[PDB]
């Protein structure tokens, strides 16, 4: 299919982020200016976020065989852009202490955001593969941005090797699926079968290898072991981006693939994903019980929260509000992770060497940084699914979706993992208030971002109806 002017209007955040990449790179070629290039990057990301309004006015349409733009794509584009803007905001005071080149960071963040937007709009195996790669490779650079530090270099090496392995797994699975199906469009994956022959062995094997790649990308058990090391070793704004934008974009494209593919309602794939979700919830909660590192603990937490999201994924064809539950949960998880990782980033700013990630460094945070401690305890309550937080609204959505589809093993897993999470999240939040032995407007902007995240988490925990109505508006093509 060709590209029309209305298709170009539906292309608007992708085009704006690409133009921002080109403009920022040419500005770096002109002169290395940290403030100017950071400002140009955040201006481009804000312009894409604003142009989402024109995208919504355009309507839902297919842009080439590769992409389909609807309310679903708009919501995930907005989430990716919000995470990228927060990542740049946290990146500037951290990069102020960086002695080497700082301007390439925003270029890499912009290209990764471009990959996130592509994954939001992806309707095709080609676009899914390209969006995953377009997220991953800038993250190879960003995780090892402070490559003189041994932890950042080790995290970069681990992430690069394992993501290349997962990409080869995903591409081999895509090739097997294409060999069975003869079409790489999402709606055709299983369409050429009938009379109860959906469980074609090559199609299932291809989807299993794609599950290997995607479950690496979503930190799902047993493709999860990279998560605490890469989360700890990466720079703290990079950890923010990797926790929010990459996970949200990859889960959104997984949502769309399982909604559109006729093989998505196969019972074998459903049982395999149920096993993966159960193991992810239980394992991610259990491994975070005895973590003295806040970044590793947040990595195991991310494993458990993606397990809850996968539980919502399993009831996609059974129930009616699986996509709405996923949208509400992902908005709440984005805000909670933005606040927690942003407090970590502000505590590690400016960059001086090793990250401030020990729990002893956050012991007694209230006595010198009271606002940051209040934000961090709000986020620990939100990630525990405590009421008057948006995390509880997401957990309630997950539980309702599981109860409707009679996924009782998954519901019990969510309850048990919630209790374990209660233990370690409360441990962090109350260690904030114990007793233990900046000065520029960009650091204040980062503090304002984490404060706004805390206020949004509390307000939408008490009053979740605006977020619920927004997510219900953002519906894909049936």
């Amino acid at each position: 299919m060709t590209i029309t002017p209305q298709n170009l209007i539906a292309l608007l955040p992708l085009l704006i982020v690409g133009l921002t990449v080109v403009v920022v790179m040419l500005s770096i070629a002109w002169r290395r200016n940290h403030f100017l290039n950071a400002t140009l990057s955040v201006i481009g990301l804000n312009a894409a976020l604003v142009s989402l309004w024109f995208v919504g006015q355009a309507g839902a349409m297919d842009v080439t065989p590769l992409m389909r733009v609807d309310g679903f794509a708009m919501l995930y584009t907005g989430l990716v852009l919000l995470a990228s803007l927060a990542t740049c905001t946290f990146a500037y005071p951290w990069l102020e202490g960086y002695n080497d080149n700082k301007d390439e960071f925003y270029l890499l963040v912009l290209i990764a955001a471009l990959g996130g937007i592509l994954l939001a709009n992806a309707n095709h195996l080609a676009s899914l593969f390209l969006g995953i790669e377009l997220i991953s490779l800038p993250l190879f650079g960003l995780v090892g941005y402070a490559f003189r530090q041994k932890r950042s270099l080790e995290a970069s090496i681990k992430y690069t090797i394992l993501s290349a392995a997962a990409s080869s797994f995903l591409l081999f699975g895509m090739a097997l699926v294409y060999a069975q199906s003869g079409d790489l469009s999402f709606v055709a994956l299983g369409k050429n079968l009938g009379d109860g022959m959906l469980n074609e062995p090559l199609l299932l094997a291809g989807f299993g290898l794609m599950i290997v790649g995607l479950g690496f990308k979503l930190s799902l058990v047993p493709f999860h072991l990279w998560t605490p090391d890469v989360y700890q070793g990466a720079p703290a704004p990079v950890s923010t981006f990797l926790a929010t934008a990459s996970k949200i974009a990859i889960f959104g494209v997984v949502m769309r693939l399982f909604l559109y593919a006729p093989v998505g309602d196969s019972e074998a794939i459903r049982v395999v994903l149920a096993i993966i979700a159960f193991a992810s919830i239980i394992f991610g909660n259990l491994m975070a019980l005895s973590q003295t590192n806040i970044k590793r603990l947040l990595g195991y937490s991310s494993i458990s929260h993606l397990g809850y999201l996968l539980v919502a994924l399993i009831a996609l064809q059974t129930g009616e509000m699986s996509m709405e539950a996923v949208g509400v949960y992902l908005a709440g998880y984005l805000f909670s992770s933005l606040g927690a990782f942003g407090v970590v980033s502000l505590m590690s700013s400016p960059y001086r060497g090793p990250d401030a990630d020990s729990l002893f460094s956050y012991r007694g945070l209230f006595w010198h940084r009271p606002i940051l401690a209040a934000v961090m305890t709000v986020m620990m309550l939100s990630l525990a699914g405590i009421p008057m937080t948006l995390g509880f609204i997401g957990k309630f959505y997950v539980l309702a979706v599981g109860v409707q589809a009679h996924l009782w093993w998954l519901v019990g897993a969510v309850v048990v993992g919630s209790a374990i999470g209660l233990y370690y999240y409360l441990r962090v939040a109350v260690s904030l208030y114990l007793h233990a032995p900046p000065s520029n407007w960009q650091y204040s902007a980062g503090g304002i971002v984490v404060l706004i995240s805390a206020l949004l988490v509390l307000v939408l925990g008490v009053w979740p109806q605006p977020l619920i109505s927004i997510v219900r508006l953002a519906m894909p093509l049936m």
């Binding site: 590209i3 790179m25 770096i28 070629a29």
Partner: protein, 110 residues
């Protein structure tokens, strides 16, 4: 068609005879001529990162070159739309090249 199979046979014989020809000259060079020994006959008569940078730039720009190779053989039936797409591709290419030159990535001399 017998013309294409004749050309396939001719191509196979060309490759085989060329490889066998260089093998035969190497064998004749090894076999012929006397050999002598000397005491110091056996005696033979850290590179910077710019080497890797140049090879890496070559690899990346060769992949973009393959994209333009695919475009250039089908320009007429891709129309002006394909021209606009390839112009965007080439502009991103030239912006990357300008960025590489301006930051000293392609400056061997200090």
């Amino acid at each position: 068609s017998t013309e294409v199979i004749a050309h396939h046979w001719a191509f196979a014989i060309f490759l085989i005879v060329a490889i066998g020809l260089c093998c035969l000259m190497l064998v004749g060079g090894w076999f012929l001529g006397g050999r002598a020994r000397a005491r110091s006959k056996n005696v033979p008569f850290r590179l910077s990162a710019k080497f890797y940078l140049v090879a890496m730039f070559f690899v990346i720009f060769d992949v973009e070159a393959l994209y333009l190779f695919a475009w250039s053989t089908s320009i007429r039936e891709s129309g002006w739309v394909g021209f606009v797409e390839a112009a965007i591709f080439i502009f991103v290419l030239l912006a990357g090249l300008v960025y590489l030159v301006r930051i000293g990535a392609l400056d061997w001399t200090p």
